[PDB]
């Protein structure tokens, strides 16, 4: 915890989208395409201060520790069940503690949203990254 620059606060959104295939895939029983993500709230480039974002997927996925080193910070897969993703954001300067986020991958639409005629599932949450200007 060393003071190296001015403290900056950046709003972010994180979570996932998912789309029902329509019919189950015969090969693996998958039913959905999904994309898990972290994004700045505003339209800006976070690679100035973020080195990489890791998305730790369920152990049924190959290379489940997925790392994205440049924008966009997204991983797209297919699946059939819901699970917890651990998201870890690493800064350029290792003086900064990584931000660890926890997110339940949502594939199944709520009955409320299904009744409001919404095609795609969206489960999105908010945060503020606090770090020093490098």
Curated annotation (Swiss-Prot):
The keyword Nucleus applies. Keywords: Chromatin regulator, Coiled coil, Growth regulation, Isopeptide bond, Nucleus, Transcription, Transcription regulation, Ubl conjugation. One of its GO terms (cellular component) is NuA4 histone acetyltransferase complex. Residues 2-134 form the YEATS domain. One of its GO terms (molecular function) is histone H3K27ac reader activity. GO terms for biological process: chromatin remodeling; mitotic cell cycle; positive regulation of DNA-templated transcription; positive regulation of double-strand break repair via homologous recombination; regulation of apoptotic process; regulation of cell cycle; regulation of DNA-templated transcription; regulation of double-strand break repair. It is found in: Nucleus. Expressed in brain, heart, kidney, liver, lung, pancreas, placenta and skeletal muscle. The keyword Nucleus applies. Component of numerous complexes with chromatin remodeling and histone acetyltransferase activity. Component of the NuA4 histone acetyltransferase complex which contains the catalytic subunit KAT5/TIP60 and the subunits EP400, TRRAP/PAF400, BRD8/SMAP, EPC1, DMAP1/DNMAP1, RUVBL1/TIP49, RUVBL2, ING3, actin, ACTL6A/BAF53A, MORF4L1/MRG15, MORF4L2/MRGX, MRGBP, YEATS4/GAS41, VPS72/YL1 and MEAF6. The NuA4 complex interacts with MYC and the adenovirus E1A protein. The YEATS domain specifically recognizes and binds acylated histones, with a preference for histone H3 diacetylated at 'Lys-14' and 'Lys-27' (H3K14ac and H3K27ac). This is YEATS domain-containing protein 4. The gene is YEATS4.
